[PDB]
Each structure stands twice: as structure tokens, then as C-alpha cells.
């Protein structure tokens, strides 16, 4: 089968291989795919990575290092396909990394170049988003680490 | 990186002298004990476990010979080329992928401390340390570029995933600051610092734990 | 958005880590017997350096910083 994932929703990709192997137990299936959702249902030993060269010439097809039978789709995407989980070509995907540097720039306290960013993130992603939770956690960690530094300075000096 | 102390030399290294014979003459396996023990079985450039590892000449004998057979220009690096693959990170990428770099402009973990040169963020990306200016900053940017610390996805994503796993632990450990006393809380901190020692990414988790 | 689980629901290995917490929280901390079995199955199927084992060990170490406050409950205890 060539491009087993063709015209399939991710939900269908989550079970196409399992259904095929259940209905045809004794068929040797030799398929090609490029979707991590299909790979999440396939053992590591069954995978052959085809990375050619500038001549299209590969010598031996290799298996990935990590097991891909119970792994999450993002992990297979980033570790087997070398694809970023977040789009690298979008400014909004670097907001939490920019914001973290800005907290750490002024030692870890929301300043102003960090409040414009925190409410840039709150307005974009939302209150209940994962990004805002990470920003709040980072704020709390910075404050607690500063209080730590004060306590350890008191103990030491 | 972590500061990895170049300890004594290995002895086999003296039997083989650069120029008289190629590095292939000596066995990398003999150089591994000193390098491996120094790095505790991890990379000297991107802290990748030595599952895929090779003796890397920081200064390529072909461009800076740097006395090829000097244990010091020998690092317990990552990746491997004999077994083939598509490695585009750390030492292998330093020799071929990066290109056009100055050997003296790269931080050497043996003598230079990456604690004041590199900062590891929660998002898994490495940035030059805060307050670096002029020359000093440029070494940090150069080494991040050539070693591809930010680069191939397999390293950035793996490091970010490793950091994100321990972040709730850091949260709860810093929530009980007032619940425990100073000595006990410092003991918890030391316990965490012991945990990251037997962990894949030594310094990213250390930066996420303490500052 | 797509109503698709991160891990496939048709595979027993996908629910192994969720079960690890549910069986860690069943004895409220402390890897017991049934929990320690689940932990080497996760360590054998998934690699020694995987998101699954790294997150498994986190749940361990976090219900070891909270059982300390409940062994601190042993200090204010009765
Ligand atoms: Zn490396």
C-alpha cells in the first residue's frame, strides 16, 4: 500500500492499521506513510526510515531510536519526522520563550515589556489556554526563586 | 554544557603521535574511559547520552591539527558516522554541517564554564547568558550555532520535553518554602540536584531547578 | 479541536502511564507492588530516556515531596 494515510482524518489514521491487521491477520503488509498518527500504532521494529542523499541513494533503511507504539503524536512528529510541534514561522509561537527571557532579564518579575507580552498572550491564547498556564507557572517560579535567593543569602552570609 | 574536568591523560595516547600516524591508528575505545568518566556517559556539547557517541577532535586535524593525538583536543562527543544515519547535531554537525567557524571562538567545557555563558530556558531553547556584551556574547552565539544546540528537532524537542516533565515538581517544591524550614528545604534542593546528576540533560534541569 | 487523543486508544500501551498515576494515587504515593510492575513494563516498552518514563518518575518524585508533608503530618501527628 502506497500512502496509507491518503484522504484519512487523524481519527481514522489512529485505527486504520489496527483494523487492517485485525481483518487480515496473515497478510504481510508493506506500506508507506508520512503521518505520525499512523506511526503511533506501529511497533518500532516495523519502521524503516528512508533518508536518501543528494543522489537519492540510500544504502540501508534504519529504524527509529524510540518506541512508537504508545507514544504521543507530537513526540513522534518531533523525534521521528524532525517537525516542530509549534509552527516555527509564527511570531505567536515564540511568545512564551520571549516572555521567559524578559522575566529573567529583570531577574524574574513581570516588568512592562513583560506585561505587554503577558496580556498579548492572554488576549491571543485565552484565559484557559495552556500557554497562559505556563506563563502563570513561570511567574510563580520566578517569584519563589527570588524568595529562595533571599533566604539562602540570609542563611549563608 | 556542564563543566567536565579533563583529568589525567590515558596511556595509549602516548604510543600514537600526530603526523607520524593518522588518528585511526589508535583505538577510540581506549580513549573512552577518560572521556566517558569525565562526562559521566553524556555529550560534551549537547549533553546527549553516549548511546550514539564518537571521539570528536574539537579542532579538526584537517583544519587546526591541534596535535591530533593530544588528549585535550579529544572530546567524548555524540553521534556516529560508521553506523550511518542522518546526524545533524553537535560534533558531527560541527565538522561538516556548520562550516566556516573559528575553533578558538567555541566554548571548551573543559576550561570554560557554560554556566555564565549559556542560559537554558523552560521552553527548551538555549540563549546567551544575561548581561553578556561584545566579545563574550559572540562566543555563546557562535557555539550555539555550530553545535546546533538550537537546530535539529530531535535535541530541542527532547530537551524541552525533559524540562516540562519536571516543572510541576519545581512548582510544588517551591510552594512549600514557608511550610518547611531552611535546612530541610535546602536538603530537598540537594536531593533534586542529585536527581538531575543521573539525568539525561544535566544543565537544563539544573537551570529549571536553581538560579 | 479534532477530538483525537494524543495516544491511540486501541493500544494497551497507550493507557499505561495514566494507569501509573491512578495506581500511584490509589496507594496515595509510594510505588507499591502493582505500581512497580507497571513501571518496568513502561521502562521495557518505552526507552530508558522517554517522555513516558520521565513523566512516570516525575509523578513518583512529586508524591514523594507531598508524602513528606504528610510525614510532616507524622511530625504534627496526634
Ligand atoms: Zn551531542
Burial C29-38 (b: 16+ CB within 10 A, else e): bebeeebeeb
CA gap A82, A89 in Å, rounded = 15
CA gap B176, B178 in Å, rounded = 5
Here the cell at position B70 is: 593530544
CA gap A152, A2 in Å, rounded = 62
Which residues are paired to B21 by β-bridges? Answer: B18
B161 at interface of C, judged by CB pairs closer than 8 A? yes
Rg of chain A on CA atoms, in Å: 23
Determine the distance separating the centroid of ligand 1 and the alpha carbon of A81, expressed in angstroms.
19
With a CB cutoff of 8 Å and minimum separation 6, the contacts of B155 are B46, B48, B89, B90, B148, B149
- Are the Cβ atoms of B86 and A79 closer than 8 angstroms? no
Q: Which residues of B touch A100 (CB under 8 A)?
A: 121-123
Here the cell at position A130 is: 495552556
The answer to whether B92 and B129 have CB atoms below 8 angstroms apart is no
Here the cell at position A53 is: 542523499
The answer to whether A117 and A152 have CB atoms below 8 angstroms apart is no
Which residues are paired to B56 by β-bridges? Answer: B75
- Longest CA–CA span in chain C (Å) reads 52
Q: For residue B22, what are the CA distances in angstroms to B17, B67, B69, B187?
A: 8, 11, 9, 50
CA gap A105, A103 in Å, rounded = 5
Cβ neighbourhood burial of C2 (10 Å; 0-12, 13-18, 19+): exposed
E strands, B22-178, where?
53-56, 75-78, 118-120, 126-128
A70 at interface of C, judged by CB pairs closer than 8 A? yes
Here the cell at position B39 is: 562526562
Q: Chains B, C: CB contacts under 8 A, how many?
A: 31
Q: Which residues of B touch C57 (CB under 8 A)?
A: 165
The four Cα atoms B57, B62, B63, B67 give a dihedral, to 10 degrees, of 60
With a CB cutoff of 8 Å and minimum separation 6, the contacts of B33 are B10
Resolution (A): 2.8
Phi, psi (degrees; rounded to nearest 5) at A11: -60, -40
- Are the Cβ atoms of B161 and C54 closer than 8 angstroms? yes
Q: Which of A79, A108, A140 sits opposite B171 (nearest CB)?
A: A140
User: How big is chain C, counted in residues?
Assistant: 78
**Discontinuities after residues in chain C (C–N over 2.5 A):** none
User: How big is chain B, counted in residues?
Assistant: 211
CA gap A101, B120 in Å, rounded = 10
Return the closest-CA partner of residue A45 out of A26, A28, A68, A29.
A68
Q: Which of B158, B162, B173 sits opposite C65 (nearest CB)?
A: B173
- Longest CA–CA span in chain B (Å) reads 66
Which residues are paired to B118 by β-bridges? Answer: B128
Determine the distance separating the centroid of ligand 1 and the alpha carbon of B90, expressed in angstroms.
4
Determine the distance separating the centroid of ligand 1 and the alpha carbon of B42, expressed in angstroms.
8
- Are the Cβ atoms of B165 and C51 closer than 8 angstroms? yes
Report how this structure was experimentally obtained: cryo-EM
CA gap B173, B153 in Å, rounded = 30
Which residues are paired to B127 by β-bridges? Answer: B119
Amino acid at each position: 500500500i502506497d500512502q496509507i494515510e491518503l484522504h484519512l482524518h487523524p481519527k481514522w489514521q489512529q485505527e486504520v492499521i489496527l483494523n487492517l491487521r485485525s481483518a487480515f491477520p496473515n497478510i504481510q503488509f508493506i506500506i508507506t506513510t508520512h503521518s505520525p498518527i499512523v506511526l503511533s500504532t506501529i511497533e518500532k521494529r516495523c519502521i524503516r526510515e528512508f533518508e536518501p542523499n543528494d543522489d537519492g541513494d540510500q544504502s540501508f533503511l534504519d529504524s527509529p531510536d524510540m518506541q512508537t507504539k504508545g507514544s504521543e503524536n507530537a513526540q513522534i512528529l518531533e523525534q521521528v519526522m524532525n517537525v516542530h510541534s509549534t509552527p516555527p514561522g509564527i511570531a505567536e509561537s515564540h511568545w512564551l520563550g520571549n516572555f521567559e527571557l524578559l522575566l529573567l532579564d529583570n531577574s524574574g518579575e513581570l516588568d512592562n515589556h513583560s506585561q505587554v507580552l503577558y496580556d498579548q498572550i492572554k488576549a491571543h491564547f485565552g484565559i484557559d489556554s495552556i500557554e497562559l498556564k505556563k506563563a502563570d507557572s513561570l511567574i510563580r517560579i520566578n517569584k519563589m526563586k527570588n524568595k529562595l535567593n533571599k533566604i539562602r543569602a540570609e542563611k549563608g552570609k | 554544557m556542564r563543566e567536565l574536568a579533563r583529568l589525567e591523560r590515558p596511556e595509549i595516547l602516548d604510543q600514537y603521535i600526530a603526523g607520524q600516524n593518522d588518528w585511526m591508528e589508535i583505538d577510540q575505545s581506549a580513549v573512552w574511559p577518560k572521556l566517558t568518566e569525565m562526562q559521566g556517559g553524556f555529550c560534551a556539547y549537547c549533553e546527549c547520552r553516549l548511546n550514539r557517541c564518537h571521539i570528536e577532535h574539537f579542532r579538526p586535524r584537517g583544519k587546526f591539527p591541534a596535535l591530533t593525538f593530544i588528549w585535550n583536543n579529544l572530546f567524548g562527543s555524540c553521534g556516529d558516522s560508521r553506523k550511518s544515519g542522518g546526524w545533524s547535531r553537535c560534533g558531527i554537525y560541527k565538522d561538516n554541517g556548520a562550516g566556516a567557524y573559528n575553533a578558538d571562538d567555541l566554548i571548551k567545557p573543559d576550561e570554560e564554564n557554560p554556566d555564565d555563558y549559556l542560559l537554558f530556558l523552560t521552553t527548551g531553547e538555549v540563549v546567551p547568558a544575561i548581561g553578556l556584551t561584545g566579545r563574550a556574547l559572540k562566543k555563546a552565539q557562535e557555539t550555539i550555532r555550530v553545535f546546533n544546540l538550537n537546530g535539529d528537532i530531535k535535541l530541542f524537542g527532547s530537551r524541552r520535553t525533559a524540562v516540562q516533565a519536571i516543572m510541576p515538581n519545581v512548582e510544588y517544591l517551591y510552594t512549600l518554602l514557608e511550610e518547611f524550614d531552611e535546612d530541610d528545604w535546602n536538603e530537598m534542593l540537594r536531593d533534586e540536584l542529585e536527581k538531575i546528576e543521573s539525568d539525561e540533560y544535566k544543565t537544563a534541569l539544573k537551570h529549571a531547578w536553581t538560579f
